[PDB]
Design a protein around this ligand. Sequence first.
Ligand code: CA
Length: 223
Amino acid sequence: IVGGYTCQENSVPYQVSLNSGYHFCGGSLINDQWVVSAAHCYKSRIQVRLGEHNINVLEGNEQFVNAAKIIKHPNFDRKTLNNDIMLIKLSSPVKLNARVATVALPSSCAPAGTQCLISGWGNTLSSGVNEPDLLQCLDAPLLPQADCEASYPGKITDNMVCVGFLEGGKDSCQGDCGGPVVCNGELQGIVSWGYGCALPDNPGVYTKVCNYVDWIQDTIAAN
Ligand SMILES: [Ca+2]
């Protein structure tokens, strides 16, 4: 998260860190045994880290659970990032509490101008890399589809939405991939891609979760 603020400890209880020896992506807990992330975050084994604030210090509220099934959307395209969405079924259900909680799926697609919360332990710099120890948050609004298309001609499909600021300075970045964009209590976006990080005229692009509520429910049901 570039240009954000440190989240209060455990105030974004659905945020998880995907770890394979180091933090590499975010995700969001949607039920006691499943997390939603981005397909670009796929790995053969993943440990899901819930209840975290400092990812390098054990502060007392972590729950670490291995991923049992890792399911990328069947039409994910690694080159255009269309359908960048993946579900992770945990090897056991987590203990839900005030610091480890679910976030709701969208009941409708959100309109341009809705204010949202984006979070993660991704790079916090617009040039080079800095990996933060503490979870970072960013308040940012969904942008009109026409601004998103004009910023990345021919690359935005109907399963993508831009969120952020055309002036640059505040954005998500690598390592926040797969994490949440929550608006008014529902998960509307998943960190996906962007040109650079926090650059003017290059807002963050996110998977539009309101297009996959059926796929999510169905998958959960079959697995
Ligand atoms: Ca910790």
